[PDB]
Amino acid sequence: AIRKKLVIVGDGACGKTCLLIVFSKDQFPEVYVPTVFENYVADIEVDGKQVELALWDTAGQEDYDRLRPLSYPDTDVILMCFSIDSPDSLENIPEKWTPEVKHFCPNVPIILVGNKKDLRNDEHTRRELAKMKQEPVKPEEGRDMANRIGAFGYMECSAKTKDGVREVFEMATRAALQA
Partner 1 sequence: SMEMDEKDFAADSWSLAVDSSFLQQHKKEVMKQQDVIYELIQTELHHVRTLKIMTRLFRTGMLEELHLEPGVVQGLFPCVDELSDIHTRFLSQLLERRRQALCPGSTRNFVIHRLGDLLISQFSGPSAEQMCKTYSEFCSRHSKALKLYKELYARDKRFQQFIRKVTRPAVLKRHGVQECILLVTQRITKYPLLISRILQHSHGIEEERQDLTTALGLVKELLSNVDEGIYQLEK
| 40 marked as binding residue | no
Contact (CB, 8 A) for 67 and 86? no
Binding mask 73-112 toward partner 1 (x if CB under 8 A, else -) reads: xx--------------------------------------
Burial readout 80-94 (b: 16 or more C-beta within 10 A, e: otherwise): bbbbbbbbebbeebe
Taking CB under 8 A as the criterion, which residues in 133-152 touch partner 1?
Answer: none
Contact between 41 and partner 1 by CB under 8 A: the answer reads: yes
Contact between 31 and partner 1 by CB under 8 A: the answer reads: yes
Contact between 2 and partner 1 by CB under 8 A: the answer reads: no
Mention every residue, 6+ apart, whose C-beta is less than 8 A from residue 145.
Answer: 82, 90, 93, 94, 112, 151, 154
Separation CA 40–CA 20 (nearest Å): 9
Nearer Cβ to partner 1 (66/131): 66
Contact (CB, 8 A) for 18 and 59? no
Backbone dihedral angles phi then psi of residue 16, each to the nearest 5 degrees: -65, -35
Window contacting partner 1 (CB under 8 A); options: 38-46, 103-111, 125-133, 137-145:
38-46
Q: Whole-number minimum distance, CB 111 to partner 1, in Å?
A: 21
H or E element that contains 172: helix 165-177
Nearest to 159 by CA among 28, 56, 32, 34: 28
Q: Whole-number minimum distance, CB 52 to partner 1, in Å?
A: 8
Choose which of 61, 129, 160, 177 interacts with partner 1 (CB under 8 A).
61
Contact between 38 and partner 1 by CB under 8 A: the answer reads: yes
Distance, first Cα to last Cα, the chain: 17
**What is the contact surface with partner 1 in residues (CB under 8 A)?**
29, 31-32, 34-36, 38-41, 54, 56-57, 59-61, 63-67, 70-71, 73-74
Annotated binding site for GTP: 10-17, 28-35, 57-61, 115-118, 158-160
Annotated binding site: 10-17, 28-35, 57-61, 115-118, 158-160
